[PDB]
Structures are given as structure tokens and as C-alpha cells.
Design a protein around this ligand. Sequence first.
Ligand SMILES: Nc1nc2c(ncn2[C@@H]2O[C@H](COP(=O)(O)OP(=O)(O)OP(=O)(O)O)[C@@H](O)[C@H]2O)c(=O)[nH]1
Ligand SMILES: Nc1ncnc2c1ncn2[C@@H]1O[C@H](COP(=O)(O)OP(=O)(O)OP(=O)(O)O)C[C@H]1O
Ligand SMILES: [Mg+2]
Lengths: 422, 50, 50, 50, 98, 148
Amino acid sequence: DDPVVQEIDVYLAKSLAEKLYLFQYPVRPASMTYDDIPHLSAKIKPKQQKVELEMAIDTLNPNYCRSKGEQIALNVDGACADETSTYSSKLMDKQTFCSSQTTSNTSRYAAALYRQGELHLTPLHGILQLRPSFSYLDKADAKHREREAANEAGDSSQDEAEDDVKQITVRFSRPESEQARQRRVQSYEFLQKKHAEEPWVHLHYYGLRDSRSEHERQYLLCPGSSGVENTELVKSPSEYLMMLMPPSQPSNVLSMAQLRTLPLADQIKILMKNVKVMPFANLMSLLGPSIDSVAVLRGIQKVAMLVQGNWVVKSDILYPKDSSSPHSGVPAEVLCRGRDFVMWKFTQSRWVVRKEVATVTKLCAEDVKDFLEHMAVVRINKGWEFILPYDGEFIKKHPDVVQRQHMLWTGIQAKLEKVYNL
Amino acid sequence: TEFFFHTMAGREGLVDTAVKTAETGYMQRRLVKSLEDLCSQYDLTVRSST
Amino acid sequence: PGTQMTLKTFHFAGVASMNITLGVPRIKEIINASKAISTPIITAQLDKDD
Amino acid sequence: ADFDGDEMNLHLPQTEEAKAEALVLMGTKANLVTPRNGEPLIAAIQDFLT
Amino acid sequence: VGASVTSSTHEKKSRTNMAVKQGRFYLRHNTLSEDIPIVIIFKAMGVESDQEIVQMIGTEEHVMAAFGPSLEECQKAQIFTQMQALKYIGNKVRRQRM
Amino acid sequence: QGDNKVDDRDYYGNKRLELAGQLLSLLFEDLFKKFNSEMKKIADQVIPKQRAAQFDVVKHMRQDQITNGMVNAISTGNWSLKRFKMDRQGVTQVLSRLSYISALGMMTRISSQFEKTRKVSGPRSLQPSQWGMLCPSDTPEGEACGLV
DNA sequence: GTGGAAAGGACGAAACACCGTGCTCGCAACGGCAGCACATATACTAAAAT
DNA sequence: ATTTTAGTATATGTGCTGCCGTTGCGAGCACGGTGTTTCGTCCTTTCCAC
RNA sequence: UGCUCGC
Ligand SMILES: Nc1nc2c(ncn2[C@@H]2O[C@H](COP(=O)(O)OP(=O)(O)OP(=O)(O)O)[C@@H](O)[C@H]2O)c(=O)[nH]1
Ligand SMILES: Nc1ncnc2c1ncn2[C@@H]1O[C@H](COP(=O)(O)OP(=O)(O)OP(=O)(O)O)C[C@H]1O
Ligand SMILES: [Mg+2]
């Protein structure tokens, strides 16, 4: 699936980055538009964007009830007050559309203008949903309340001058508890008052049919060459994945990745502690081909010994100086001596008798069994055999390491003959 | 799957018996408390306590 | 027999439908003499049954 | 009973009249059949039928 | 066949239910004296146009046929703005014992 | 309201398991809130009228409150959280030392919210959702069949 | 090594009412036969128009 | 004076908030019992001075 | 009072 056709370019424009708004009418289908509806004004605020459109609707059309219009006009306003009237005439002529804010940040939204072979993107400063507001009914209810108050006052034809002098009811500015102060701050009335504190800005309306629309429509484009290598947007896929997914911040506890994050010496030590028997090629494969063989060899020479061409972890590594036998409680030095004797017997001969080791080392059956299971398997009619076969390739490749391990085993054999009186 | 279905059937039977025990206990209590008054007289007529 | 009754199912009485309460719930509804019972059944005979 | 750990009670009457009434009315030989339908309950069981 | 939702936060757990007892949906909560129609709550929560409410409920013919009685019951009353619906709800609110 | 696609309560995909950690967290939160309220009350009662000897909480920080609360809640097994209005019973049970298998099986027990007192026979059934999660055969034979 | 006075810590003790402040929840566990409020339907009866 | 409409008057008939039930007998065990919140009497122990 | 059991 190759990109056969339609290799469209993408351009970016910053001319209307702060002046582009998206108005969507959730109650008006796309078929009917407001192009023919003459608009009158638009109130708006720069901060805390909430636009209120004030448009005009016809009356002589058959789809308008003049009687109900007169009724609603008499209900919302007074008889002939006209000082603050929601409608200039005696009919419902103006309609109010109020905007609700969809989201706070609109950086991820963009308007795309498509031309032949190009697509121009322009960021959106804000997105608002315009719905028909019902605000004249609130003023109608307030006027009905004041008319009820007037009717209450008019119970008598002539009202005597009431001695309703306003006694000084200056209330204490009580120190408000922090909880009650937070409740007042989080109250809806406080938020509405804070929103109303910002002054309104009046704007005129220019329809799509206006020449100014087609005049300013060209600002969504940008002057630039067809082929230009962008200086930015050059990060690798790994860097992009790290950007869009930022991080939050037994002895086999550490995993393979946590192992590879550790230095090479720690990796070799942990691997020899976990497996305790492994060839050199397997260690090179596990650590990785990007690591030099000499460094791995130097690291394994400090935590392992050579037995029949294979590598067996040292006794002190498995048993620290403060550890003890989980089965008998003997000190770790005796366990190290016994394991060294077992490894020496394995270097001398491939077959090791469990009873002979138990007699020489004077240890219990479970400790000898644990020592043998770490590096041997049970072969019927033959005793215990080393789990890995004789690896002569590593011996032929590194004779100096073989000689070093041979003299080390000679020293260990001298120590064992001194201790156990072999 | 067959073992799970068999265990489902067994548990259904167990809960059925568990409900049946208490339900029939209450029914037996009511029936005996209502019917304990009748007795066969010597004139071959079954009469109540009154 | 209430304890002996298993409260079985699938006993549609030959019509393979019209789930009717039978068993301990049925005996309870009978002995309670309730005016309104669950799943009432009325059997009507026809003059021309053929 | 099924002899799988069931505990049973054993009462001793303290009156000659009660003892005689128990032996006569509640005698095992005199209650070989249930009053429900007259069927004999005290009969052969497993390892006796086989 | 009604609905129930036990909204539980770190502070309060409130189980609010919705019923169709009379072909129309009533919302029941422990903080309300009487269950109120769902359309009144819709009008109280900001959305006042009935067309938007119907679009939010669904555009299927059977959905509108089922939701018709609720719209009719809402239009029977004079609740058409957010303030009127909030006042109607507050009338159904009882103080937590002074 | 059309096709009877009524959701079932016994579906374990809608079930949640609270371990000892969450219960102990709620209990410690309640006890700490009670301790803070008691300390605030002691402060309000002592500081404004006692003497020029300044009041300090150290002379009134009772250490037996949280200890006694934890001990009682763990021993008696009844948990009464007024801040959450939760009144639970039988949360803690005496570990059965009849055998090793007894304790090992009782350690992995799970009780139901139904808190058996009546014949529900709706959660007592073996739902197919228990596959791989809960043992189908292991259940106490008796009145607690299906809810433990 | 000693003492006369000072504080404080512990154990009775009396006013008030199991929770420091006055708040505050959820859930019904499922039928099922009494009911009591309302509501309201209809007809009987009597006042009014022709 | 008589037929038609208005009221009232009770009865009846469909709800909706109450109270009442939910097998049996057996055997163990753990825990906690009403208390507690502040006031005051008593006793003792130890900050400096001798 | 709670709970685990025994049929
Ligand atoms: N929390 C708790 N309540 C108990 C205990 N024993 C009895 N009760 C309560 O006391 C009621 C039963 O009392 P009984 O068990 O007859 O008391 P009792 O055995 O006669 O008491 P004694 O005469 O001292 O043997 C129950 O309603 C329980 O609420 C117990 O060990 N712990
Ligand atoms: N709640 C109880 N009420 C009355 N009797 C009980 C109760 N629990 C146990 N029993 C006694 O135990 C007996 C129940 O055994 P039953 O149900 O017939 O065999 P079972 O327990 O199913 O054995 P299988 O599972 O068939 O091997 C009958 C009854 O006398
Ligand atoms: Mg048995």
C-alpha cells in the first residue's frame, strides 16, 4: 500500500490565531443557516469568552403570531415604559443567543481550509456553543413580582405616608470562618458576579454574503514556497513517544530490564547468583553483543570459577558473611568450604558421590543435597553428574584464563587439604 | 467446562434444598398450629375443641 | 411431602408453556386461601370439541 | 439417618403411665407403617436388599 | 424496569434512582421530598431547549415515542427556563432538620 | 424497556474486593479525625480561660485512643464508621487451627455483602464469571452455602 | 544526708444524659394482609325557570 | 306546578405507608460487660535551700 | 451477643 496519489501539502497560518472562533448551533441543522437573518449586535468579553448574539426576526411572515407577540411583549416589559425594553416595538422582534464554553484549552483544535493541492491549518482561540437563551422570561417574572408589589401597595386608593424610615440595620462584618469563606467563593452567585465584573464589548455582524467575509477569508492562507524543510518537527519516533508519554517520576526480584539498567559488574553478579551454572557464550548472548568480551570475562573472573569449561558462581557470593544455612543454621564459612570442596571434586572428576562428600565435609544431608542440586543432576548407577557438558571451545579460546583458574584451584585444593585433612 | 457446569448444577441443588428446608419448616409449623385442635370423637364425628 | 417435594421444573403439564407454580409455593398459595394467586388456570370444555 | 455423624436424643420417662403409653402407642412394632398412605417405612435397606 | 446509580466519592455516597412508573421518567433521591420529572432536571442543569434534550436522549423513533409523555408532562407545567426549574426543585427540597 | 436486557447483580465483573488494607485505611482515617476533633475541643476548652501558662497539646495527646480503637475493631470484629455511616459485623474471625489446610484455606476466604440472614438464592448460585478467579467446589455446606 | 512547703497525678464524685459540634446517613431483605386518606362518581334531592 | 340543573352526601373503590412473619436441634469459641467528662480531695514525690 | 461448625 504505497502513497499512489493525493500527496497534499500542509501549510500553517498564524494571522488569525487569536481571532478565530468556532460557533456551532446544537439546535440548528446545517440545512438552515443564519445568512438571511439580519443580525443587530454581539456582546463579547476578551477574557472568559461568552458571546451573546442579538438578532432581529421578521413579523409580517405568516410563521409569526402577532397576537402572541403582543402578549409576550406586554409580559416582558411594561405598558409604555420603554426605558429598558427587551423589544423596541410592541412585538417580539429581537432574539438572544447565548454561548457556553466547551473546553478551557483549544490548542489541539484547528480549522483546515482545503485548496487544490494544499491544506492550511489555523489554530482556534476558543470554541463556544450558541443556544437560544431564555432571558426575557426572567425579566417578565421580575416585572410580574414588581406588579404584584404595586397591587399590594394599591389595596387602598389613597396610601398614607408610611413611617417606614429605614432604621440603621448595619450588620456586623463578621470574621467569616475559612470553611464558610471557601463555600462563599465556590458559590455560583460569586462566580456569576465575578464574570459580570468584566465589562462587555459590542461588535457588529458581517454576514457571509458581505464582501468583507471574502476579503478576510484569504487571511487563513500563508505566503510560502511549495517545498520548504521545516526547521522543527524533526524529532525521532522514540523522542515523540517519550514526549507524549512522560514517565511518572527470592533473589530474582530484579527483572531483565532492571538488570540491563545496572552496570555490567552488577549484571554479571546477579546472573551468576540466579543461575549459578552457565557457559560463557550464554552469558554473552544474555548481556548483549554490544558489550566487549574482555570486560565480561574480567567481570565473571571476580564472581565465578571455571569447572570443566563452564562457569560456576563463587561460594561467598551465594552465602554472605552474615548469612547462615536455612536448614541447619551453621555459619556461612562452613557452607563456603563445603561448596568449594564440591566444586574441587567436580573439577577432579565429573562424577561425585554424595555419601563421600557428606562424610568428608561432616555436613548434614540437606546441605549437601542443596550444594549438589545447584550444579549437578542425579544419574542412576553413576551418582551425580555435572549439569553442563564439557565445554572445550572456551578452554581452547582462552588458555591464560584456564591457567589462572588452574592455579586458583590448586590454591583452593591446598586450603581444602589443610582444613579437611584430605 | 463440564466440571464447572456440574458444580453449578450441584450448587443449584444445594441452594434449592437449603430454601426448601426453611420453607417447609414454616409451612409445617403453620399447618400443625392450625390443625392440632381436631380429634375423632366416639360418635364417629370429628369435632373441634369448642 | 413438602420436604419430600424437590421443587422441580419443566412440568408444563404437556403444553410446553404456561409456567404454573407447582410444589411448596402452590401448597402455600392453596392453604393461604389468597383472593389473588399467581398464574391462575381455568379449564373450559367445548360443546364442539372436535 | 445415614450414620455419618448424626447425633440423636434419648429420653427416659419418669412415670409408669408415660412408659406404658410410649410402649403401646409409640412401639416400633405398632408403627411399621406411616399414617400418610399406609406404606411400610420400617423395611429392608441397602446391604439387606442386595 | 428502572435504573439506579450509587455515586460514591471519597466523602459522600448517594444512590439516585430513575423510574418509569407512569410511562414517564421520574428521578428519585434521598434529598428530595418527591420524585420530579427528568425533563425539569434537564432544564435546571443548563439545557433549556427540548430539541437538545431529545437529541441527547436519542434519535430513534421508538425512543422519541417513549420519551413523548415526559415532554408532554413537562409542557403541562409552566417550567421552561433554568430559574423556574430550579425554583420547582427547591420547592421539593426539605431542610435537614433546621 | 423493550428487549428484556436487564443487567444481573451476580456478574462478578461488577464486583469489588476490599482487603484488610482498605478497611484499615478507612478505620485509621476515622480514628485520626476523631483524635483531631478531640484535640481541637480540648484546645477550645483550655486555651482561652486557664492561665498565663500557655496550653500545649503534648500534655493532652492521649495515646490510648487509636490503640484501643484498633484493638477493639480487630478483636470484636464490628466496625462502626460514623463519618462513612458504615455499620459492619463479622469483619474479623478467629483463625481456625484445626490443621494446616484449615488455616491455609481460611486465609483465602471471601464473604459476601449479602451477610446471610435470609434465603436469597440469587447470589448463592455458581455464576460462570467465577472462572479462574474463585473455587467452584469449595464452599461451606450449610446455611452459608454460596455466600462464603 | 534532710526537711517544710509546693505541685501534680490519680481516684472518688455529682450533674446530666452515651456523639468534641448540635447533623444526618443509606438501605429498604421480600411478600402480604389489614388499613386510612383521598377522591371522586354518581345519584338523590331540592331550588329555580318556564 | 313541573322538568332540569346544582349540590351534597355517602359509599365505594383504587392506592400507599404500616406491621408482621421468615426449619429444627446440637456443639465449640472470643469479647465485653454503662462511663465518662470534668471537679475536687488526697497523697506523694521531688525544685531548691540547709 | 456475635461467629465457625456438626446433619
Ligand atoms: N457480646 C456478648 N453478648 C452476650 C454474651 N453472652 C450473652 N450475651 C448477650 O446476652 C443475651 C443472652 O444471655 P445469656 O447467654 O442467656 O446469658 P447467661 O449465659 O444466662 O449469663 P450467665 O447467667 O452469667 O451464664 C444475648 O442477647 C446477648 O446479646 C457474650 O459472650 N458476648
Ligand atoms: N438445615 C437442616 N435442617 C434439617 N435437617 C438437616 C439440615 N442439615 C442437615 N440435615 C440432616 O442431614 C440430612 C441431609 O442429608 P442429604 O441432603 O439427604 O444428603 P447429602 O448431604 O446431599 O449427601 P450427598 O451430598 O448426597 O452425599 C437430612 C437431615 O436430617
Ligand atoms: Mg447425616
